[PDB]
Homo-oligomer: A and B are copies of this chain.
Amino acid sequence: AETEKHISAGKARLQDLRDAERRCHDAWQAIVVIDGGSSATRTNVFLAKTRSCPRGGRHIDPDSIRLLGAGKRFAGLRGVLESWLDAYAGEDWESRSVDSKRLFQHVPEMEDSARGLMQLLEDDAVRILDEKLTEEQKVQVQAMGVPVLLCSTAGVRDFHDWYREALFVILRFLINHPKPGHGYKFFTNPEWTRPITGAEEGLYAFLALNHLSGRLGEDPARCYVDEYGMKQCRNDLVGVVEVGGASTQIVFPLQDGTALPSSIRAVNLQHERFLPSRFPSADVISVSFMQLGVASSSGLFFKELCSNAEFRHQGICYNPCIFRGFRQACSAGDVEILPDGTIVVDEDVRKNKLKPVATYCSANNPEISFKAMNEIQCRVNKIDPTKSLAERLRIDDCFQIVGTGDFDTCQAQVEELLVSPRFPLPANIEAASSGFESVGQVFKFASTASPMVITGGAMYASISTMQGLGLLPKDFQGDLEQLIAASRTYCSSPVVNNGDGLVIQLPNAEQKLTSMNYDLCKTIALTVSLLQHMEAGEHKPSSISWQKTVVGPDGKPRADLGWHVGAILHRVLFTEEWGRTAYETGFTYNM
């Protein structure tokens, strides 16, 4: 009778072991993406759970990806390359003609320069892993191998010759040789670690948004039978708008009945190898505008507005997009606000809001001497390639830029000079891009009924601070009526010194004036403009929202929006290919 509980416990012990070799087991794995921006490069550490089953291999559960922590801001890749060329390529490689072949001599100094940055990013990630992982997770993360995807954006896109290509071979090498002591087996390869174009950044933000919000499940959302008796599976994907420092990207789903112009094309994510075949066909419009970045637009707006005699009375340029009370030297240099109230503008050409557009519109750039037309097209944007860097960056006859704080005019100018200029600067043609030259064209010719979300540091903050001010309702959903009324009140607030530094006197608050907010109404105008074009298209988005973080089923944050998790999903959703590259070849390839 007691020799009966011994039988049941023996039957159980056999069953546990049988059970253990039969079901899928899960392991934790870290994935780091290193963001190579213009001004800085910093690491982002992600955690996800892998799963493997007796027969079959190993996959990442995409639903399980969460942001563990972003790191400290370290030096930009541009700034690394620039230090190298300054020290070895001659004093004037930027002005004088470049002799590339003399540089091969100092590749160990570039490699040496890069080892400094890569060591710091490795250490920083290790700081975050150790910090945030449980004891349990750490030993598994160590065992699994940790993928690293280093993707550079705007800062490195301009570098001609072979330099950018050599830096990445160096970079990858440094990543493949982590220090053995900490035990995290970092590895990467030429597919993951690469420069990426603005339009890719856009497609990644698109995959990131739709997956984080559960629109891209394993199963489709609906599968009906169509008007010709055939099964159609569909996902209800959301469209995304992202205004970044260097460029604005817009990516959304195509309508069904929609006639594209010639020269314009819908990019199919499956075809361009951005999403696997087992998800329904995803056709999108996908733009990326270098003029429409926060920074690039500031320099463009300065050149275009202040060259108009309607705004340049008697040596002073009157900018409607800057708060009244703000006085500034007349260039697109880096604004800095001193502790006391002094406003200093940087004269360093590298530290300039027009620098990117101007080095593009250079005699140096082979994209200009390529076709005689793109010289004229950007001379019309008042950036003359035959004239020098200094002449390109400045407005003659201008002593000081003075803030006016007139939203209607600011909005008018932003509309006219940035959103839909009659002659926009060149559209970069590529697999990920649709072809459109600017926003006006997008919603005139290819508008969508799909829901829309707006993203970007300043986009989010400007609305949010208005909401906190009581100027926008707390359930704001994009009503232009309310947005324009709130924008008028906010942007007419004066800048005054009470003794505590420069502030913005709002009706019910004081907001510290920084170099990030002084012209903030330019992007509010840009919001207004953008909501107008969306309202006027044949098809209108079913709803609109502003987002930044996306929260988990548990109620706590999963990840931030943006290209980071898109870069992950691009590799990870391809189960068989990922299985091979991450686990089969993986970190052991480095031995």
A contact set with B: CB distance below 8 Å? 3, 6-11, 13-14, 17-25, 27, 52-58, 101-102, 104-108, 111, 139-140, 143-144, 166, 169-170, 172-173, 176, 189-191, 227-230, 261-263, 265, 271, 366-367, 370-371, 429-431, 579-581, 583-586, 588-591
Q: Is the CB of A588 within 8 A of B106?
A: no
Closest to A22 in B: B228
- Specify the chain B residue showing the minimal Cβ separation from A25: B589
Chain copies in complex: 3
Which has the most chain B C-beta neighbours within 10 Å: A17, A19, A56, A139?
A: A17
Partner of A588, one of B143, B589, B591: B143
- Is there contact, CB below 8 Å, between A53 and B585? yes
Pick from B367, B583, B586: contact of A262, CB under 8 Å: B367
Residues from chain B with a CB closer than 8 A to the CB of A263 are 367, 370-371, 429
Q: List 21 A-B contacts (CB under 8 A).
A: A3-B105, A9-B105, A10-B104, A10-B107, A10-B108, A11-B104, A13-B107, A14-B166, A18-B169, A19-B228, A21-B169, A21-B176, A23-B228, A23-B230, A25-B589, A25-B590, A57-B581, A58-B585, A261-B367, A579-B579, A584-B584
Q: Across chains A and B, which 7 residue pairs bring their CB atoms closest together, nearest first?
A: A57-B580, A57-B584, A10-B104, A10-B107, A58-B584, A6-B105, A52-B585
Q: How far is the CB of A262 from chain B (nearest CB, A)?
A: 7
Interface of A is mostly: helix
Q: Which residues of B sit under 8 angstroms from A430, Cβ to Cβ?
A: 262, 265
| B58–A7 touching, CB < 8 Å | no
A233 to chain B minimum Cβ distance, whole angstroms, is 15
* Nearest residue, chain B, Cβ from A162: B14
* Minimal Cβ-Cβ distance residue in B for A145: B588
Given pairs A10-B106, A22-B190, A25-B589, 12 additional interface contacts (CB within 8 A): A10-B107, A13-B111, A21-B173, A23-B229, A27-B589, A55-B191, A57-B580, A57-B581, A57-B584, A58-B585, A140-B591, A261-B367
Closest B residue by C-beta to A23: B228
A58 neighbours in B (Cβ, 8 Å): 580, 584-585, 588
Question: Is A589's CB under 8 angstroms from B366's CB?
Answer: no
A7 near B262 with CB under 8 A, answer no
Q: Which residues of B contact A139 (CB under 8 A)?
A: 591
A190 touches which one: B54, B166, B229 (CB < 8 A)?
Answer: B54
Contact A17 B588 (CB under 8 A): no
B429 touching A7, Cβ below 8 Å:
no
The closest CB in chain B to the CB of A157 belongs to B262
A591 touches B371 (CB 8 A): no
Given contacts A263-B367, A263-B429, A591-B27, contact A56 B7 (CB under 8 A): no
- Name the CB-closest residue of B to A371: B263
**Smallest CB gap from A427: residue in B:** B263
- Min C-beta distance of A4 to chain B, whole Å: 9
Task: A229 to B191: give the CA distance in the assembly, Å.
Answer: 19
Q: Which residues of B lie under 8 Å from residue A586 when comparing CB positions?
A: 583
Residues of B within 8 A of A583 (CB): 583-584, 586
A193 (CB) vs chain B CBs: closest residue: B21
Chain B residues contacting A54 (CB-CB under 8 Å) are 189-191, 581, 585, 589
Min CB gap A103→B, angstroms: 8
Chain B residues positioned under 8 Å from A140 (CB to CB): 588, 591
Chain B positions within 8 Å of A6 at CB level: 104-105
A579/B584 contact (C-beta < 8 A), A170-B17, A228-B19, A263-B371 known: yes
Report the minimal beta-carbon distance from A8 to chain B, rounded to whole angstroms: 8
